[PDB]
Design a protein around this nucleic acid. Sequence first.
DNA 1: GCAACACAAATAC
DNA 2: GTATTTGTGTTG
Length: 290
Amino acid sequence: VILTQLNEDGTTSNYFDKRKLKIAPRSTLQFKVGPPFELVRDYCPVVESHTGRTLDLRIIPRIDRGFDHIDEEWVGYKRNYFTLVSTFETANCDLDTFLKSSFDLLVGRLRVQYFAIKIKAKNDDDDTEINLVQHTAKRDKGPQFCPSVCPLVPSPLPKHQTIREASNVRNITKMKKYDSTFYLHRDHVNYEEYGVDSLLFSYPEDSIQKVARYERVQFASSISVKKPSQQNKHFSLHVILGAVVDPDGIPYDELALKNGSKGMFVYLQEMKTPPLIIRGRSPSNYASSQ
DNA sequence: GCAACACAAATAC
DNA sequence: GTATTTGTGTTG
């Protein structure tokens, strides 16, 4: 009934079929590593502005809740939360040098203001976009929002155990413990080490995430999860790394900048999951039906 | 179909 | 021992 795999940090992922077994909402068995992501493609190259060297980038994503590996499929539930986290790394550039430098897109050169990640859900068979929704811990007693573009600096991806432990931290002391893992506070650096043109000082806010954490995410409540044939639809979750630029023929999305002008999230790399099945709200997807 | 409302069980403190 | 968080039962 429960299939167990050892995660890289020594935690376990425990895959069970919610049609055959109900587990408590807050059980650690609800936390598990989801499907691995694969490269879709690389898009616009990025180069350091004086040396001219190309920045070698890699998205590092993981799902830590909401998907089980059952009967050779990755399976999620429409009514339940999933968690998707990602960082990116720059193989040829250490963080401290990276934040002091400046980077252009090699399209003939747009300045990168900052790097950022966004997620999307798609119908994997036709590439149609599928709406995602997020809640706060308060769920219906709090606001719903759509996943947002998250400015990020490069960082290792925290272990599954760390994502787990930080999922519902209220206490102020425990927050301090995790702060350095999830955030870079720009206001706390020595300003005199940085040039006016440095990458770090073109990020939009002082609080910069090192890890994009999309928690309490759900497929929109209106998505059809089956085809007309009653076969299950196949969905996929995508992580896109972009460079935000000021636009004053390559793939990009428009973004509402801080100053209010229209910017461009210019695509740099994209990864995605293998096909995913999502089980709808029907009683037959649940063990209580039996 | 689905929003809103309900119950319950383990975590966080 | 209390409040919170979240899977999932029920309603109309």
